[PDB]
Every structure is written in C-alpha cells, then in structure tokens.
Ligand binder design. Structure first.
Ligand SMILES: Nc1ncnc2c1ncn2[C@@H]1O[C@H](COP(=O)(O)OP(=O)(O)OP(O)(O)=S)[C@@H](O)[C@H]1O
Ligand SMILES: Nc1ncnc2c1ncn2[C@@H]1O[C@H](COP(=O)(O)OP(=O)(O)OP(O)(O)=S)[C@@H](O)[C@H]1O
Ligand SMILES: Nc1ncnc2c1ncn2[C@@H]1O[C@H](COP(=O)(O)OP(=O)(O)OP(O)(O)=S)[C@@H](O)[C@H]1O
Ligand SMILES: [Mg+2]
Ligand SMILES: [Mg+2]
Ligand SMILES: [Mg+2]
Lengths: 746, 135
C-alpha cells in the first residue's frame, strides 16, 4: 500500500521532459514543482524528468508525453514507480547520434539548426540511452543520447560539449518509432475517442481477467461519417496504442480478385487473427463488400456477403477478437449486418466545429515554421464546411506557395541540398489568405450539429419570453427532482408565431446557447427538396440525429412554406407533415430532445400540430415597443464605431411600427453612406496629392472614422415599413384565437 | 451462506448448483460417512479440498438451455409444447393412432426476441435429436 505506484493517462502539456502530477499526491509523495524525478518501467528501463503541477490531473493517474512513454516501454494504463532524486549532477561530454531513417533527406549541418535552440534556457534532464525528438524545418528528427561522461544521467549545462559527428545508427527491432500514429495526431473528436477507448481498452488490456469474469464484450464497432474525417486514422491509432495485433482488410482489394481468391482471403484473415489473439480486424470500406440486397447482382457478390455473415456469427467460438469497420453512411450497408452479435455498436464521427478545426490546424503545422503574424484562430473561424482532409490540403498548399516565392528568389543554386534556405523559410499570413480562396470545401450539404454562438445580448427586448423559455427548456434539465416530486410531466414542444422579422430564429438559437445544448436547424424548403420516394428515410434520419446528440434543440423554421405548397396536387407537403407528426408521437422525453417551430402565417397551419403532446405551447412574438426599439438599435451597433452625437431614442420615436429587420436595414444603409463618403475622400486626396507632387504635409489619416447624425438622418428618409396596419390587426386577432383552430374553426 | 439455516437433505452422488459472483458453480456430494443420505447439520465437516473431477458422458449439464431461461412468452411456449411434446414423447402410440401431427412450425417476430433460444430449449427439454441448418 504505497503512494508512489502510478498509472499513465494522456498528456496535455507539449514538452518532451515534463511530467505532471496533482498537488495532494505531490504533498503526500514529498515532491515540489522544481524537482527532478526518476521513473522506473518495464524491462528495467528508467527515465528522468521534471515534474510540475496540475488540477485537472487526478491522484491515481499521471500524465506524460509520448516520448517519455516510449522510452519506458510503457503503454496507456500500465504501472510506473516514481521517486525523487536530487542526486543529479552536471556533465562534461555528451555524445548524440541521429537515427538513420529521419536523416535521409537533409545533409550539411545539424548542430546550429536543431540542437542549438533546444537546450537554451532548458537544462533538460537526460540519461544514457534515451531517444528524444526535435521539430522544425518541415521535418521532425530523432536523436539518442548515447554516452555521458558523468555516467549515466545528468543535466545538459553549457559545460557539456555535445558530439554531433558520426554515422546515424540503425534501430533496434523493438524500438517503438515516432512516425507511427498515436492519440496526439487526432483532433476535434474528443468524445468519440473516449467512447472507443471505453469499449476497446479493457477487453484487450486484460484478456484473462475479462474471460474470467463472464460478461460479453462488444464485437462489432461500426465507425461512420462523411468522407475524409479520419476513420482509418482512428482505427490505426487505437491499434498502435493498445499494442494489439492488427490485420487490415481493404474493400476494393478483396473485390478486385477473382472469385475463389476473394472467399479465401476473407477466411485467411479471420483464421490468422485466431492464431494471434488479442487482435483487431479492420474492414475498411465495408459498403464495397456488402452493399444493399437490391444493389447486388449475381452469385459472387451475394456469396461474399453470406461469407462475411458466417464469419461474424462464428466469432463467438473464438477468443478475443474485435472487428471494426468503416463506411460513409449506414444506410447503404446490407441490414442483416447490423443485428445483435454482428455490427451492433455504432460510433458517429462528424465534421468538426471551430475548436476542432483549430486543433487540426495546429497538428498539421507542427514541422513547419510560421511567420509571426499568422494567427490560426482566424483561419479556424474562416474555414467552414472543411473536414480534416481539406485542412491538411490547405496547409500543404500554403507551404508550397511559400516555397514557390523563395524559388522566385533562389532558383540557381537551390538545386543542391541546403539547410540554410530551409532556415530562412517562413510562411506568412498572405499565403493562408491566398489558399483559403482557392480551396473547394466538401461538406456544405451536411447538417451541422453544434452549439450556436448567439447569446442573449444579441437580442433586444422580449423579456418575459426569455423567462418562459428558461422555465420550459432549462428547468427540466437541471432540476429533475422537482418534477418528480410535484407529479407533473414537462412538455415537449413550443410554437412561435407572429409578424415577419421580429426575432424568432434568434430566440431559438439563444436558448440553445444558454443551456449549452446542441442545435439542429431545418428549413421548409429543405424538406420540400427531399423527393417523392426519398423523404421518408430523410425525416427519420433527422430524428435519429437528434437522438444521438442529446440534449438537443431541434428547430423547424419556416413552416409557412410547407403550408403554402399544399393546395397550390401538393402531395409532398402532406406526406412531409404526416411524417413529422408520426415522429413527434414516437419521441420519448427521457433523452431531453426539445422541439420548436416557427410561422409567419398562423392561419394556414395544420391544426393537428397543435394537439396536446405535440407543439402545444403557443408563444406570440409581437412588434417591438419604444424601449425595445432602443435596445434593438443598441444591439445591432456594437461592432460599428458610432459617434457620440447620435441620439438613438430619437430614432426610436421616429420609427413606429417597424420590425427588427427594418431597424437593421436602417443601420446597413447608414453604413453604406459612410463607406461612399470615405472612398470619395480618398479618391480626392489621391488626385490632389498626385496632381501636386512634393506636398509639404504627408498626413495619411482617416478623414471620417465614425458615423454621425447626417448619415442616420439621411438613411431615415428611405425607410419603409414591412408590416402594414391591416396585418397588425390580423395578428392581434390570431394572438387570442389560434388555439380554437382544432374544431370546425375558421 | 448456502447451508446456513437451511438443513438441506442431501444424498451421495447428487449434483447441486450455487449462484453468486458473476458465475454459477456446480458441485457433487461425493461421500457421506452416515451413508448414503443425510441432512447437513453444523456437525458435518465439509471437505472442499481436492481436484475438480471430470464429468460422466451422460451427466446432463446445467449450462444447457431449458424453459427457465425464457421469460415473457408464457402463452407461445405453451402452444409449442402442445404441438410438439406428444408426437416426440410417444412416437409408437401416436403412429398407432392414425392422426396426422403437425410438421411445419414457423416462428416469427422482430429481431432479437429469442427464437433460436426457444427452439433450442424445446430440443433440450424433450430430449429429441436436433440438427441445426443455418441460412
Ligand atoms: N481529425 C483529424 N485530425 C487530424 N488529421 C486528420 C483528421 N481527419 C483527417 N485527417 C487527415 O486526413 C487524412 C485522410 O483521412 P482518412 O483517414 O483517410 O479519412 P477517411 O475516413 O479515410 O476518409 P475516406 O472515406 O476513407 S477517403 C488523414 O491521413 C489525416 O492526414
Ligand atoms: N429582437 C431583435 N433583436 C435584434 N436583432 C433583431 C431582432 N429581431 C430581428 N433582428 C435582426 O433581424 C434579423 C432577422 O431576424 P430573425 O430572428 O431571423 O427574424 P425572423 O423571425 O426569422 O423573421 P425572418 O422572416 O427570418 S426576417 C436578425 O438576423 C437580426 O439581425
Ligand atoms: N425472452 C427472452 N428471455 C431471455 N433472454 C432472451 C429473450 N429473448 C432474447 N434473449 C436474449 O437475447 C439473445 C439473442 O436472442 P436470439 O435467440 O438471438 O433472438 P433471435 O430470434 O435469434 O433474433 P435474431 O433475428 O436471430 S438476431 C439470447 O441469446 C438471450 O440472451
Ligand atoms: Mg479510409
Ligand atoms: Mg429567420
Ligand atoms: Mg436467430
């Protein structure tokens, strides 16, 4: 019962000689955050590192980098003893040698480019026989600390002369390489990688214990997503990091053979993974082998599908084999493969969000050298609809434009192998600014599931509606116990209705931002574009995406288009509304999926939507008042530089009966007047400066930097109301008599 | 915990079964000194040391499937017993009657509701020969 045996978890820090610990474990273990610890591992191999602190780190777990993890012959979830050692002295001679595979391109220097900035103000604790890694110069490079004269371990001081001359040596056959793929090469998919580790790590770490329990493990894991999102990468990383045997079956490579060779290749893969248990068999591109029953023709294709089903069912009589697979959508797989005892667990890898895209861009720009203006958060906010492969291509294209301009400088003697041109080489912001425009993203039709970025501050007015939406959406998530006590059940749906342009889409986004839930937006034209024989699996697919990503807000915008397409034979409108109604009835509230609709025409809505148990909360969103108009105009003008002279309350008194869209239109029109005036002034000053050279005052400056009362008072003369007064009386009537539409009605 | 406040009447040569610990376990009462049958009192010292022995080839195992592994389908299992139990219990008598039995029984339902299980249980519990063809 010792407090020094610890177990490895994933690393957050980026350094090669830093381990992390939580503070109570250090205080029990008598360690401070400047110490120099010694770490023992399997096959009697040990390491030396600098410890620091963390709060996200637990006590039963230590977080260390992959380079330390591979110098200890340790994988994820293994045992390591830590002990303090202030017995570390400085050095005199330290002999390093590169490793033969990483040094086949460059020749010339290795000391000043690589080793010189690495040990400067670092004092990295090294030991004899350790491999370390340096990034820089569009390449990563390995070295091994071969010999220390104060043997065996020391701290690299400026006293130590570092021998970097000799032959790059060969590897030992059990040295784990650093060009392999691990968990740090994957970004933007934290949750899914956690699920796959939970499913897979225990039945492959502990086969004997888990056989001795008597529980069944999973055996079929189907990864799916759009093309190019890193599924082959995830399977390869789980295989390398658990250390299991790994056999790869490729889809076209099996279907390209002749007949009896295809059957025997499948059978040999499953037998060979019997022999070397534990294993992982990865079937890449499954829908080339086993597509739909109606899309196969012949004897050979159906015979291969039946072969694969026999082997998947016969895995039960085997020991410790996981079968993974990958496909671009689940609906094209033969549905007999997704039963029980076959591919029964599904993991969905989607397109990344903004945090994900920044993390991809940081992965691919490791070995490159960036210029000092390049801010990758702006690139990550610009690139929308990019999967990971597109971001890798964008980084590669920017690097090639930089090397092309340096061949515009240096072309004559650049043909030799120089390290200096690589030293000077840098990628500016305009290269990324170029390659952003000449890039063709590939996931724009895909439905986006993310948290929105519209807070409550973008919305002006509407103060009781916000309270009512909190009490509908947020309260049965945070406080389920009150609803258990008082004996009621929460409701499921809301319908917003009202005049055009008053802020319904913004409210539906802001409550999803408030509750930190996902958000799926569907518009009426998107449902009507879905075809005659195609709308069915599509509406079911949207309600499935809502169940997988719960707690969710599923928002049906623009219902008046679906209503107007009925009656001019409008059969597709009736088919879509009936199928939405059936899916709402089937939905059980124990996943916290919450449904919202919105309409500008509350007179032609289908009354069966308003039934209790369906969208039966009716919130009327009206034209704003004078205080509300002041709040709207303040909300739209937060980014614009506005002069002090502007009176907003005067604009609110002058604009009566406007909606929110018209107030935004007035702001847009005034800003265009400002840009026109500025460009006239720049043409006039350029003309005058060029027509009178040698001017005594070279004073470049903003002539008008802000928006004054002239611009708003001119933009006010072109204002037009969007909602006429007869319409206002009709919306006031429906505000009270909408709920009576279900009987005979009107 | 098994024999505590139980006083279970045992006999020499019987197999019994204990559940617990994410596993079921078998034992056989091999030898009683008041031969052959007795009641397990706190007087009895219970020898639980030795080698776990092999089975006899006609010992019916308890990892097989019977009618107690099926739940939630009382009515249908009653129908299948009525159709099947008499023509397989008494073949000679039923041939001597002159009535035809059924010969094709189609079980159907959604995926995952235990159809393979029901057929396997009827096969084990009647003791008929059983051949499995897989599609
Ligand atoms: N999440 C990611 N993080 C880092 N790199 C990624 C990521 N996703 C994709 N990539 C890069 O994109 C390349 C192609 O990804 P793939 O693994 O081929 O994706 P995929 O699932 O194979 O798509 P298909 O349908 O097989 S073409 C990878 O080799 C990586 O370089
Ligand atoms: N209450 C409001 N506060 C701030 N901006 C608003 C408000 N209402 C409307 N806007 C602005 O007007 C635009 C239209 O708002 P939406 O919420 O999309 O209105 P809508 O109810 O969906 O009606 P339409 O048909 O879509 S214009 C928004 O993008 C805002 O720029
Ligand atoms: N009524 C039940 N009582 C107890 N366990 C059941 C029951 N139904 C299913 N199971 C369990 O579910 C497992 C799978 O059932 P199966 O016998 O495979 O059903 P099934 O009819 O084979 O479905 P398919 O279409 O063949 S995949 C069984 O091995 C049992 O563990
Ligand atoms: Mg692939
Ligand atoms: Mg809108
Ligand atoms: Mg079956």
């Amino acid at each position: 019962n010792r407090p020094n045996r610890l177990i490895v978890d994933e690393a957050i820090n980026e350094d090669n000689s830093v381990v992390s610990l939580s503070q109570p474990k250090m205080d029990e273990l008598q360690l401070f955050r400047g110490d120099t610890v010694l770490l023992k591992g399997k096959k009697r191999r040990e390491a030396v590192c600098i410890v620091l602190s963390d709060d996200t780190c637990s006590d039963e777990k230590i977080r260390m980098n992959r380079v330390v993890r591979n110098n200890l012959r340790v994988r994820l979830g293994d045992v390591i003893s830590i002990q303090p050692c202030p017995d570390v002295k400085y050095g005199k001679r330290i002999h390093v040698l590169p490793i033969d595979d990483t040094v086949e391109g460059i020749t010339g220097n290795l000391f000043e480019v690589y080793l010189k900035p690495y040990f400067l103000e670092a004092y990295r604790p090294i030991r004899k026989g350790d491999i370390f890694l340096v990034r820089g110069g569009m390449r990563a490079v390995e070295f091994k600390v071969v010999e220390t004269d104060p043997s065996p371990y020391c701290i690299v001081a400026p006293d130590t002369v570092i021998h970097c001359e000799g032959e790059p040596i060969k590897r030992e056959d059990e040295e784990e390489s650093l060009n392999e793929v691990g968990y740090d090469d994957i970004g933007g998919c934290r949750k899914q990688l956690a699920q796959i580790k939970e499913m897979v790590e225990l039945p492959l770490r502990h086969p004997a214990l888990f056989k001795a329990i008597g529980v069944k493990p999973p055996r079929g894991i189907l990864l799916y997503g759009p093309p190019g999102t890193g599924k082959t990468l995830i399977a390869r990383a789980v295989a390398n990091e658990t250390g299991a045997f790994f056999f790869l079956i490729n889809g076209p490579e099996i279907m390209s053979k002749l007949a009896g060779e295809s059957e025997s290749n499948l059978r040999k893969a499953f037998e060979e993974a019997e022999k070397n248990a534990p294993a992982i068999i990865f079937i890449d591109e499954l829908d080339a082998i086993a597509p739909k029953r109606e899309k196969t023709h012949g004897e050979v294709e159906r015979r291969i599908v039946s072969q694969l089903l026999t082997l998947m069912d016969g895995l039960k009589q085997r020991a410790h084999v996981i079968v993974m697979a990958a496909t671009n959508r689940p609906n094209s797989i033969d549905p007999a493969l997704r039963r029980f005892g076959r591919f029964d667990r599904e993991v969905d890898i989607g397109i990344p969000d903004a945090t994900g895209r920044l993390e991809i861009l940081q992965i691919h720009t490791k070995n490159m050298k960036l210029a000092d203006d390049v801010d990758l958060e702006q690139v990550a906010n610009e690139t929308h609809g990019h999967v990971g492969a597109d971001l890798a291509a964008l980084c590669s294209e920017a690097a090639l434009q930089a090397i092309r301009k340096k061949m515009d400088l240096i072309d004559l003697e650049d043909e030799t192998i120089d390290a200096e041109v690589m030293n000077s080489l840098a990628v500016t912001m305009d290269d990324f600014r170029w390659a952003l425009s000449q890039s063709n993203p590939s996931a724009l039709r895909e439905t986006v599931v993310e948290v929105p970025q519209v807070t409550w501050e973008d919305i002006g007015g509407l103060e009781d509606v916000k309270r009512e939406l909190q009490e509908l959406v947020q309260y049965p998530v945070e406080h389920p116990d009150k609803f258990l006590k008082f004996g009621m059940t929460p409701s499921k749906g809301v319908l917003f209705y009202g005049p055009p342009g008053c802020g319904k889409t913004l409210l539906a986004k802001a409550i999803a931002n408030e509750c930190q839930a996902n958000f799926i937006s569907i518009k009426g034209p998107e449902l009507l574009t879905m075809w005659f024989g195609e709308s069915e699996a599509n509406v079911r697919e949207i309600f499935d995406k809502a169940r997988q990503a719960a707690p969710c807000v599923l928002f049906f915008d623009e219902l008046d288009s679906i209503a107007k397409a009925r009656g001019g034979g409008g059969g597709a409108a009736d088919r879509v509304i009936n199928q939405i109604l059936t899916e709402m009835d089937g939905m059980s509230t124990k996943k916290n999926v919450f449904i919202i609709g919105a309409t500008n025409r509350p007179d032609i809505i289908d009354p069966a939507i308003l039934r209790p148990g369906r969208l039966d909360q009716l919130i009327y969103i009206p034209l704003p008042d004078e205080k509300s108009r002041v709040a709207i105009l303040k909300a739209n003008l937060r980014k614009s530089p506005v002069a002090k002279d502007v009176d907003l309350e005067f604009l609110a008194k002058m604009t009566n009966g406007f909606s929110g869209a018209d107030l935004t239109e007035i702001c847009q029109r005034a800003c265009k007047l400002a840009i026109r005036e500025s460009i006239e002034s720049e043409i006039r000053r350029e003309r005058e400066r060029q027509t009178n050279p040698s001017a005594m005052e070279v004073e470049e400056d903003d002539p008008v930097p802000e928006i004054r009362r002239d611009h708003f008072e001119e933009a006010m003369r072109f204002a037009r109301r969007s909602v006429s007064d007869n319409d206002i009386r009709k919306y006031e009537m429906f505000a009270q008599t909408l709920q009576q539409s279900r009987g005979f009605g009107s």
